[PDB]
């Protein structure tokens, strides 16, 4: 029930696949851990917002509405999840 080191769960080839979809030929080795950190900070932002939406809603389960709405506020609007 304790979760300790899940930032390493976003594997290095997963980052390679992400950069391939973004259109990258070559990825340095220093890239993976800081993109883990950057994505970490990004989820800190959006999940902090969604947690505030959640505790405002007096529910205990984070929903897709809270996700898409938190992305919507930050100029990162997402389609396809009931918005």
């Amino acid at each position: 029930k304790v979760l300790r080191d899940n930032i390493q769960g976003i594997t290095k080839p997963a980052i390679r696949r992400l950069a391939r979809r973004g259109g990258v030929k070559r990825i340095s080795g220093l890239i993976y851990e800081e993109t883990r950190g950057v994505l970490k900070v990004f989820l800190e932002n959006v999940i902090r917002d969604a947690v505030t939406y959640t505790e405002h809603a007096k529910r205990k389960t984070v929903t897709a509405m809270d996700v898409v709405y938190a992305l919507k506020r930050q100029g990162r609007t997402l389609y396809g999840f009931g918005g």
């Binding site: 609007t77 997402l78 389609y79 396809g80 999840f81 009931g82 918005g83």
Partner: protein, 95 residues
């Protein structure tokens, strides 16, 4: 027993059939169409509301939304939306 959840299914369905008699749609593309029309409606409605507040107008008319779609919709889409909305209010006032 269930509760009704509103969507923009049938209208997008009739439009896609009218512009393409043979072409179908997936369910996820339908969800993205629902999200798109909701986003555009909220943008135009918010900008129309702000135009209403800025000249101290408590009413929203087609002039207000015409101003809004001139603000948001870039270039050629603006004049085409002006054309269709003008024709639409033309048939609405004539009937």
């Amino acid at each position: 027993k269930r509760s009704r959840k509103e969507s923009y299914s049938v209208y997008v369905y009739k439009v896609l059939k009218q512009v393409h008699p043979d072409t179908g749609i997936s369910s996820k593309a339908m969800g993205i169409m629902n999200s798109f029309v909701n986003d555009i409606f909220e943008r135009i409605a918010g900008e129309a509301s702000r135009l209403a507040h800025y000249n101290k107008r408590s009413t929203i008319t087609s002039r207000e939304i015409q101003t809004a779609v001139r603000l948001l919709l870039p270039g050629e889409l603006a004049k085409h939306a002006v054309s269709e909305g003008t024709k639409a209010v033309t048939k609405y006032t004539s009937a």
